[PDB]
Amino acid sequence: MVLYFIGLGLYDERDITVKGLEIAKKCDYVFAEFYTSLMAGTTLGRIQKLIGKEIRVLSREDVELNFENIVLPLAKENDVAFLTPGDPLVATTHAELRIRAKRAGVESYVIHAPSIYSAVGITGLHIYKFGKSATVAYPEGNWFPTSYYDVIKENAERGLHTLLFLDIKAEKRMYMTANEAMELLLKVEDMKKGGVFTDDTLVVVLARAGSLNPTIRAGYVKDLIREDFGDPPHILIVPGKLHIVEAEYLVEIAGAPREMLRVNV
Amino acid sequence: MVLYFIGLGLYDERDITVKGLEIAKKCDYVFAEFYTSLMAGTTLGRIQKLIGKEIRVLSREDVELNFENIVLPLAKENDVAFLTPGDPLVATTHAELRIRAKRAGVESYVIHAPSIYSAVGITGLHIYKFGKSATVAYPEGNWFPTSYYDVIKENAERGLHTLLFLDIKAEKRMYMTANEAMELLLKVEDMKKGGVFTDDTLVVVLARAGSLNPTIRAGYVKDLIREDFGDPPHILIVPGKLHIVEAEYLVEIAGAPREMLRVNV
Numbered sequence: 001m002v003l004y005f006i007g008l009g010l011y012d013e014r015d016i017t018v019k020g021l022e023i024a025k026k027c028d029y030v031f032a033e034f035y036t037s038l039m040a041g042t043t044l045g046r047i048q049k050l051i052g053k054e055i056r057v058l059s060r061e062d063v064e065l066n067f068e069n070i071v072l073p074l075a076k077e078n079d080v081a082f083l084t085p086g087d088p089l090v091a092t093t094h095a096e097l098r099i100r101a102k103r104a105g106v107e108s109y110v111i112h113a114p115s116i117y118s119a120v121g122i123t124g125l126h127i128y129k130f131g132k133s134a135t136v137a138y139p140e141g142n143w144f145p146t147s148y149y150d151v152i153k154e155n156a157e158r159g160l161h162t163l164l165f166l167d168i169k170a171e172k173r174m175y176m177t178a179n180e181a182m183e184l185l186l187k188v189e190d191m192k193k194g195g196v197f198t199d200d201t202l203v204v205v206l207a208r209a210g211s212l213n214p215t216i217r218a219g220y221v222k223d224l225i226r227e228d229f230g231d232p233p234h235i236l237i238v239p240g241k242l243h244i245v246e247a248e249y250l251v252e253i254a255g256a257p258r259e260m261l262r263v264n265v
Numbered sequence: 266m267v268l269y270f271i272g273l274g275l276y277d278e279r280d281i282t283v284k285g286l287e288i289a290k291k292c293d294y295v296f297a298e299f300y301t302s303l304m305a306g307t308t309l310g311r312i313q314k315l316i317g318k319e320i321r322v323l324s325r326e327d328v329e330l331n332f333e334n335i336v337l338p339l340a341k342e343n344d345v346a347f348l349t350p351g352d353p354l355v356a357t358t359h360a361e362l363r364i365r366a367k368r369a370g371v372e373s374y375v376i377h378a379p380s381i382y383s384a385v386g387i388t389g390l391h392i393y394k395f396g397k398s399a400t401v402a403y404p405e406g407n408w409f410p411t412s413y414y415d416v417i418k419e420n421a422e423r424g425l426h427t428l429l430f431l432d433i434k435a436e437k438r439m440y441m442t443a444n445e446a447m448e449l450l451l452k453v454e455d456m457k458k459g460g461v462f463t464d465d466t467l468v469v470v471l472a473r474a475g476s477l478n479p480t481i482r483a484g485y486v487k488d489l490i491r492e493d494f495g496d497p498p499h500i501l502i503v504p505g506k507l508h509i510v511e512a513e514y515l516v517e518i519a520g521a522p523r524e525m526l527r528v529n530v
């Protein structure tokens with residue numbers, strides 16, 4: 001009669017909380033999805049070994065179209081867990097799944113875990129300063145989406161930072177690199193001409209948040225657009241005007257260029 | 266030899282990540298601060314038991330003025346951990362502590378944990394739609410803070426949701442309730458008369474996120490301002506423009522008035 005939405009955390013199998021693990025171990029059935037994000041520092045096998053339960057993976061269609069006939073039926077007579085990377089309900093559509101549970105007479109509880117939304121705090125950028133967030137999508141066919149560029153413009157205009165998620169093809173396991181993200185934004189700038197993203201724009205790249213050795217880099221596009229940030233996934237941030245302490249942290253921790261202490265503060 | 270910034274999570278000792286627990290267990294010295302937030306479902310005793318180490322609690326003064334005198338010295342010859350509620354670098358000034366560590370020749374690592382910043386997901390509000398965040402502070406003497414009101418105005422203007430961290434006076438055991446926050450806001454509205462926060466404003470309250478049964482309520486200020494939302498900690502959220510599914514979740518899960526199902530596009 002109970003469904004537990006349990007977050008898996010940022011990087012590897014140890015990013016799940018003690019509460020989430022203990023609850024997952026007591027569940028009769030455990031489902032998981034890895035289409036919204038992928039746990040780059042571990043594997044399904046390692047996660048299954050830690051939880052000590054067989055994990056049935058669900059595709060996007062399984063969830064969005066058939067959550068009520070795949071997961072909920074079992075949650076009516078047993079304790080069921082639904083595992084997701086990061087913090088449950090961060091993914092836009094996930095919250096609605098609790099409404100489906102209700103309508104099916106199934107109770108649901110949420111067990112939180114670290115999310116990139118809060119983990120980006122490791123860049124030294126003040127969390128309260130983040131504005132609306134967005135996702136950089138690949139252009140294709142006759143479709144060139146550029147809304148993420150407008151998001152950056154509006155936030156920046158108000159001195160706010162912009163958290164940018166990069167495109168991902170979970171199934172195909174193909175990621176968009178921060179490098180590719182920068183190339184696309186430069187292309188959009190050439191069309192929009194809004195002076196929002198140029199070779200002189202200061203950006204921050206975060207890779208493998210959650211690991212003991214994440215990659216945190218900050219600098220100007222002209223210098224970072226060809227740098228090697230390691231294996232995906234990458235997160236790109238376009239910070240608004242920086243608080244002095246933010247710039248110093250980037251300089252001291254992320255090896256940012258001295259220049260930003262005077263140019264972007 | 267090294268310093269660990271380890272987050273403890275939202276509610277109780279089990280909100281720490283497996284990674285954080287296993288590392289905390291093998292540290293020679295463990296320090297902690299419990300003034301940046303309230304973990305209403307645990308005690309120092311329970312935390313010490315889980316980690317199996319004695320924890321020396323530091324005050325805001327100990328940290329902000331003497332971190333390099335109390336913590337760092339030991340990190341030069343031992344493995345030290347500094348524990349904090351939620352995520353160590355979120356809505357705190359702890360990021361700056363890493364600079365002190367570096368300048369002292371001490372390498373540091375960060376172990377994230379569930380944070381209120383991402384936990385807002387349980388409100389059903391799309392996380393990407395939150396804009397600049399703010400803190401509602403207790404007026405002090407003739408000083409009556411009001412900046413948070415302008416933040417709400419800026420966000421609502423963009424149709425973005427506003428997350429409001431609430432004040433805390435740890436040494437006085439004082440934790441601002443959502444009720445007190447709304448009262449202060451109504452008073453600021455009377456002074457500024459910007460039509461930003463009135464009795465008809467839709468607000469969302471999230472109390473004791475992280476527990477298995479947090480209080481999640483949504484509705485008009487006039488109806489919520491005197492409602493008992495349970496023990497602290499609380500956060501107040503003032504949504505911007507709602508998507509259909511957001512409104513639906515507020516009604517179905519947060520008990521909002523069914524008329525809120527209708528949205529003014």
Ligand SMILES: Nc1ncnc2c1ncn2[C@@H]1O[C@H](CSCC[C@H](N)C(=O)O)[C@@H](O)[C@H]1O
Pocket residue numbers: 118275276301302303350351352353354355356357379380381382429430431432433471472473474475498499500
């Ligand atoms: N579990 C919880 N439930 C509701 N509000 C919470 C909360 N934890 C923190 N808060 C809010 O956040 C404020 C502290 S700011 C510190 C946040 C912490 N670093 C984190 O990552 O979560 C509290 O005063 C309250 O306003």
Ligand code: NA
Pocket residue numbers: 130131132133392393395396
């Ligand atoms: Na945000």
